Amino acid sequence: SMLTFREVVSPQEFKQGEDAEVVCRVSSSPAPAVSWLYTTISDNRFAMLANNNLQILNINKSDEGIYRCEGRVEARGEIDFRDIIVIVNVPPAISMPQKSFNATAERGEEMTFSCRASGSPEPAISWFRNGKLIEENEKYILKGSNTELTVRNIINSDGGPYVCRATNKAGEDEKQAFLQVFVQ
Question: Which of 15, 52, 64, 123 shows the greatest Cβ crowding within 10 Å of its Cβ?
């Protein structure tokens, strides 16, 4: 008969752009009246479903926060609540402002490619050459959480594309830069 919150998982994670359903399973006898707070909610994308869950259409990163599921046994003036942390994951999106680079072979030249990514959780950035993971050594320098790849001692075989990939639990992005190598 008393308010029981059987399922109020926190946090609950959702992918940006999905129609999120925030789950709150609360029971009592008589059945509970349920309201959601974040102060009461009054937005066009927000609505309570028949099962009392909170729907957030087209959920956005900015919707992230603490939402309160409140149950009331109105017959007995009993009111209880649980707070649920809503997290919004955002797939990576790479910024690679320059995609075309030139260098001249066999002059000791180096070139740095830049790749930054937005996303949540923080995307891991890796570079690939011919589909193979590039690791730091005498030829390749990686700086700034792998956002800057430097190719050292450029020769002809360094010409062609280099790919940066940005990955998190919500997705992956990739962009391709090309190095043109001239003969002296």
Answer: 123
